[PDB]
Design a protein around this ligand. Sequence first.
Ligand code: HEM
Ligand code: HEM
Ligand SMILES: C[C@H](O)[C@H](O)[C@H]1CNc2nc(N)[nH]c(=O)c2N1
Ligand SMILES: C[C@H](O)[C@H](O)[C@H]1CNc2nc(N)[nH]c(=O)c2N1
Ligand SMILES: Cc1cc(N)nc(CCCN(C)C)c1
Ligand SMILES: Cc1cc(N)nc(CCCN(C)C)c1
Ligand SMILES: [Cl-]
Ligand SMILES: [Cl-]
Ligand SMILES: [Gd]
Ligand SMILES: [Gd]
Ligand SMILES: [Gd]
Ligand SMILES: [Zn+2]
Lengths: 400, 402
Amino acid sequence: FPRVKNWEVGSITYDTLSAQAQQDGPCTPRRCLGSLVFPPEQLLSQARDFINQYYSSIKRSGSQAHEQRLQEVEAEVAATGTYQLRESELVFGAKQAWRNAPRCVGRIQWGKLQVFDARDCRSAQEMFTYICNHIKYATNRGNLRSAITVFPQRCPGRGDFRIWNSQLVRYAGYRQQDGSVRGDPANVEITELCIQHGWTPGNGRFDVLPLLLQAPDEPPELFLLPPELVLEVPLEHPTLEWFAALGLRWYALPAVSNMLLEIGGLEFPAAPFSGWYMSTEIGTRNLCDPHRYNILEDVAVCMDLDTRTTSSLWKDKAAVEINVAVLHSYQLAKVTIVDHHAATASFMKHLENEQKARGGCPADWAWIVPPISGSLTPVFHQEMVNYFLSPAFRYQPDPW
Amino acid sequence: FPRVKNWEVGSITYDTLSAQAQQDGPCTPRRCLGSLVFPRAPEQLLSQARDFINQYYSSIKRSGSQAHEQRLQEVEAEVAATGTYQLRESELVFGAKQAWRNAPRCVGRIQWGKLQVFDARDCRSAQEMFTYICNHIKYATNRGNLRSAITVFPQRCPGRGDFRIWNSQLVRYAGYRQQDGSVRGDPANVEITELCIQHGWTPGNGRFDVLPLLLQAPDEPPELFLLPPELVLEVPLEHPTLEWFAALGLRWYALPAVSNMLLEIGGLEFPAAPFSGWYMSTEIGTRNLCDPHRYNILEDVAVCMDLDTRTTSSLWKDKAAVEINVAVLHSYQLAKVTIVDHHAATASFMKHLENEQKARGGCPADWAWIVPPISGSLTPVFHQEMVNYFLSPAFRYQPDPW
Ligand code: HEM
Ligand code: HEM
Ligand SMILES: C[C@H](O)[C@H](O)[C@H]1CNc2nc(N)[nH]c(=O)c2N1
Ligand SMILES: C[C@H](O)[C@H](O)[C@H]1CNc2nc(N)[nH]c(=O)c2N1
Ligand SMILES: Cc1cc(N)nc(CCCN(C)C)c1
Ligand SMILES: Cc1cc(N)nc(CCCN(C)C)c1
Ligand SMILES: [Cl-]
Ligand SMILES: [Cl-]
Ligand SMILES: [Gd]
Ligand SMILES: [Gd]
Ligand SMILES: [Gd]
Ligand SMILES: [Zn+2]
């Protein structure tokens, strides 16, 4: 059992939960690959195990309802070749997949999740309405609420439900007479898919993209989001009056719409989950990555910093203020957001909860440690262990 | 072979060098332990020696030659006879440079070929050991124009104990347990401070008292040796625009010289082989001065900066840390002592990975040690995927000799 040390306090724990690890990771005794971003009747094996998880989690192992439910999943697969989850189970498995997400620093919140059941969905126009209930419920006028919407589970012979966008809110990315990009350069591909399928492109650096929703065995269909439903935050700084002039904005709702939910052997290729932002996500990665909006030098010029030498730490100073601007703006607009110090301190509380409850916690060090001020947060000094537990959110290929 | 992506540019390479990794790390396909700090007969000696000799003869464009098999047979005959063997001088220089080259947690490896190797394998006593060390400190410091160097003391051998330096670095500040429960000085150094005292050192009571050296000759208790103050170059810390900063009374020393690691070359072990380069400013500014379990100055600086420390979202911790790093860079520059900031160091490490991809087909790197502890994603290494594995020659950790 791996020994795990915290170097700030000098405290030691053992990760016994690592024993239950399901799907193998990318590392071998020969080499570590932890820093890499992207690393038939077996369906009954995983279903049986997930069902035992549910009943132990409600102190109902070895009793009547536990025995009972085991047989009907057995009979469901025998007759149909698959099975349906009870409502309580789909709830319990959504929370568990979030709980088991090693790259998420916000799992202290994993027990507070609103689960929308879109398993009776049957058309792309139905998708849009379900997605639209989600967005408006999750946004909640800025008092954000964690939510996931689960569309039908995949089956043989029939196509997949899929959202083609990586998130529900993305900004446009436009090429030019010189190749380079206006807007968000991450979303250059989906932007050109949307232009293909009928959307007339805007001219701005912060155009909210239209959705591309895919009913099974039908091609994707464009859907224009209601602008009154996409809450956005214009960015200003508390004491740098010119910051507002830079015209920067970000949206309120972080909602990943490209990952595949897996519960008890069942696979849901369309299942958007949403929470609220950690401020480094917007202020550090989205606005300052060189391949993203890359605003770092523009802000430094406006601050009259000396950009001619790296040792003035002008990059560091300008980055800190961009993060100050994100936090101040979201708080003034009363949109839920959490800074990387508060977020990481709650994660340390989570680890300790999880140590007592489950005997460990799969955590991915490179992604839990924030991208500014790493060693100023407690997670930097906490050793972690990474492994795969089910249920889980999984990456998946793109549907083109 | 593992595919490696650079997410900032789009570059894609394949680490073929990892296939040669001969010793095992701590990860399995079940679980990654990459974030853990400490993740750890004649024929086996023979097979590592054979491999190193092959490495050396590759480096001198004499692979498969007369001289090459000459050395291979020679080493076996010496192992059969003596149970071990001796490196030629040129083999030792090449082996010390490869060990640096091979060190996955060093971001300054663009410099790996520029290393001054001092051969002290004739050292006879703790007293002679001390003399060799003073000369190392003197040459490396070079009045502030620092030069990378390593001194190699006699190798491990059956029949006689090891040479050991008990201090983890040649220059360390004392850490005295206080009256209440606090530490005065550097809390990382309470243990070695206590060993020096119990070995008859007279402790000071400052926050920056330089520690004496505890030097162990084979089958001998360690002996205390004081470093002459004029040999230990230090830097008073000031801030270019925060004049009150000088009143903190903070200093750091010029020379980073690790003295507690084991140098392995072709199966032979040198448990005493201190090595030194020059600092990257974050080791001092961020870790040494701002870690809660170290000098822990972050809040005091932020209060002095008139920041609002009652709420995290004002980012007072980030702002104060940035200026503490400014103070470090400015102060070493003022004093004309070599130092590299985390933006320049990571950008030269990017050129090292490129150089190494063409020379060897990859490069062992520990992402969590390479990415700086402030402003991580503002440096290019954050966006570089990396493959961590173990090559030999190597610097390895080893247990404390007490
Ligand atoms: C409630 C507040 C939440 C916060 C502050 C938060 C924070 C974060 C952050 C900062 C990341 C790093 C992702 C990146 O760097 O792009 C992340 C990853 C992730 N989070 Fe959370 N999260 C929250 C809620 C949730 C919820 C509700 C779910 C699912 C139900 C979830 C599941 C995940 C997953 C699967 C990842 C991995 C993303 C990927 O690998 O691309 N999180 N989270
Ligand atoms: C010349 C300038 C150098 C720079 C800028 C530099 C930079 C660094 C830094 C920042 C670390 C991380 C240390 C920590 O966080 O405690 C490190 C580690 C290391 N360096 Fe370098 N270094 C230099 C020279 C050298 C030399 C000359 C050698 C050996 C001949 C060396 C071998 C190592 C080793 C073995 C480690 C790992 C130490 C440990 O794991 O505790 N370095 N280096
Ligand atoms: C190469 C490296 O794995 C990659 O840049 C990772 C590092 N850590 C990260 N951590 C988070 N939270 N999000 C990321 O996108 C990344 N990127
Ligand atoms: C727990 C964690 O592995 C530990 O704090 C590591 C993180 N990365 C590091 N990186 C460097 N360069 N030096 C360190 O001491 C550490 N410490
Ligand atoms: C649920 C959730 C919350 C949050 N704060 N962040 C995310 C991920 C954002 C997308 N990244 C992959 C770019 C998801
Ligand atoms: C040779 C060398 C250069 C450098 N820049 N830094 C170090 C590390 C100092 C000690 N750390 C292990 C705490 C060593
Ligand atoms: Cl995002
Ligand atoms: Cl140090
Ligand atoms: Gd101006
Ligand atoms: Gd001033
Ligand atoms: Gd004071
Ligand atoms: Zn690993």
